[PDB]
Design a binder for this molecule. Sequence first.
Ligand SMILES: [Zn+2]
Ligand SMILES: [Zn+2]
Lengths: 79, 95, 64, 120, 54, 101
Amino acid sequence: VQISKKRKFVADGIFKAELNEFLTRELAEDGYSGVEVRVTPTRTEIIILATRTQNVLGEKGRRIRELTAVVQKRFGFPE
Amino acid sequence: MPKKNRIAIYELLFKEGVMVAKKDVHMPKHPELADKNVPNLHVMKAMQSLKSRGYVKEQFAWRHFYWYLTNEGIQYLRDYLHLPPEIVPATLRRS
Amino acid sequence: TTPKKNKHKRKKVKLAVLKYYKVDENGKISRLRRECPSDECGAGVFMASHFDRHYCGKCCLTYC
Amino acid sequence: FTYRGVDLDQLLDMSYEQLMQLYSARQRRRLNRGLRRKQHSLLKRLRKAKKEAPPMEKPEVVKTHLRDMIILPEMVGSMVGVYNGKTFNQVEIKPEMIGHYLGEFSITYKPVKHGRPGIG
Amino acid sequence: HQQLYWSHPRKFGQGSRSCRVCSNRHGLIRKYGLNMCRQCFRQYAKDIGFIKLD
Amino acid sequence: IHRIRITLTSRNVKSLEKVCADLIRGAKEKNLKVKGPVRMPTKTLRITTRKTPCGEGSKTWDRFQMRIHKRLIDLHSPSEIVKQITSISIEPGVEVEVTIA
RNA sequence: UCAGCCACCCGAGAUUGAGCAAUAACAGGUCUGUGAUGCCCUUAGAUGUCCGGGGCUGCACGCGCGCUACACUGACUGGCUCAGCGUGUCCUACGCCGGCAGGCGCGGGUAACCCGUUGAACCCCAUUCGUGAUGGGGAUCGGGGAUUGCAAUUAUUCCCCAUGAACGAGGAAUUCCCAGUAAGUGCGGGUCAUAAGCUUGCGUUGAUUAAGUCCCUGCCCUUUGUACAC
RNA sequence: AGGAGUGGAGCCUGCGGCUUAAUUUGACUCAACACGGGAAACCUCACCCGGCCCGGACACGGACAGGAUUGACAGAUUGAU
Ligand SMILES: [Zn+2]
Ligand SMILES: [Zn+2]
């Protein structure tokens, strides 16, 4: 069995609040603007908005790779 | 601390490079390093010792610690795990 | 009234297996103190025979 | 002294389940939910003070830390110090206090003696 | 030592429950499974999805 | 085949009714017998917080709300075509749940 | 004869109730909500922290929110009959044992599907009691009994027997309110292991009087005059 | 113009005040006083009486593998295994 829709819809909120808080605290230097969490049972993608988006990636897609594994091992859902 | 608890902490700091926590002192088991019986205290204080060396990046949140690799952390791990540089972690897998 | 601070420090003999292991000129290895019957301290780890008991280092067992 | 219609001497050999039914529901609930290592150690030290004392000398004051302990018929006669928070006090276990806690004879507050009032 | 450290049982009561974002224990919203402080819910209520209609 | 029911829950009403209209129009495109979007009693979660952080002022309170509109459309169609229609109109802010047989 | 005001007709309705709310200000409160934070203090007989026990509640006296009331437009006992906003993994349907609080098993419900037709209380219809410190009013106390908990003595609560206090409508003063509104009456949410006399919501019954003024309380504007420009 | 009151009684809660080992503390006209989601048996918890632990990272010098540290049964002391 799963959780009730009342407790489900609020738990989708505390996810995006802690995510946005941690994203502000980490990416407060490269001009972080906001998340957009497109949920899908296959892949719950998280769209980062930024000012200089090429500098967010790191060296050919290196810095955001750390954040992928962070949000993977943090919130319990598998890779 | 015992030495066998520390050695399984650096292994998931190479292929991925990150390590999270909870800031729970009395938590008896760190849930990610299961089947080793290491407390949350003995990964949290170990990474506090590693941050004064300068080998993990400090970023806190609501409750969870967060620790990234440093660019000098790869060379310090590749000898401590006695690895060759021929194998590649998740840095250069896609494209 | 007075701060009573104390801690029982450890005092080790010069490689205290010489208190356990005795070998004579023929070369047989004679251990004077008790070997603990427990398996986690079996056949290598010895108890210490005291004035009324023995005492293990791992499972802290006593005797009479 | 008789408690619930039976004298003191039959209470000393009274077993647990038949000792139960002469209590209230709170004491029976305490004896039903069980007594733990912190109380059985006090039974051990209390029976120790029975055997290590000479019989004409009521034993040394076994200072206690269990205010919640019901005065069983087995612990009658022993000298006991009950911690109130600051000090101890030796209290004599008279026979007529079986249905009571230990922690009620140590008054944890000084009784208030008033004076003239301040600003009002 | 190792047995007497966290020996008092931290089940029920406000010793058992604490704020999700700041680890405080006074004024905790438990309803719908939040476990936020009252002061801390007001910071994040627009991002949770709680708005003021009246 | 009976009891093929789709659960559509959202936090807003406009995107939810747009997704409902697109699913009903797509089920009209497949020529199925379609129970339309029924409208469940909308839930509204009330949280009433003191507005102050300390406790000094004139006892003003807050009143937060989350209105969860829940719709249900229903089909009587075999299981291979109900998965095709739900996979097209992927859209944020809503949540889809299907049940079969 | 302008902006608009008043009355009526037709109409569901000729004011629904809230939310949000400027500039400029308080030496307003809050480092005790924050891994928001400056300095200062403290740091291993620790102002860190765990453990255990007390205390936060102690009681000659003052001051504020409230609850129960002082009865007959009432109380006691049967009978009958109606909600809405909400919560629920801990809410509860059903059968049995009990005076009852409660024990047992069985199910349903992650929820317009189960509790639940949410078979609420004042109100109604009958019986008894009849103006007295009464059976009104239940405080204070003795005994048991049962739950929640590691633990109930400084009664945690809850049930049953007893005891029966002041209280005879309340001075000086003072609060709130103009319509489904006061007021009566219950139910739900928060707190919640156990828990509401608190608060925040909801329904039920449902009125008196006013539709005006600056007299008081206080705020604002215009003509005075200044020895004022903190 | 009125209606319900409150202030009067008991009780419940919050403030002063008297005590207390401690009765943690903020807040004092409107703009404090059933407010601090503050209905705290333990925790909460600040306060009082005791008792453990380092959870003193890191850098320097010494001790340093003739050991610094830890668990320690039993007896004594303790409130405790
Ligand atoms: Zn061993
Ligand atoms: Zn908080």
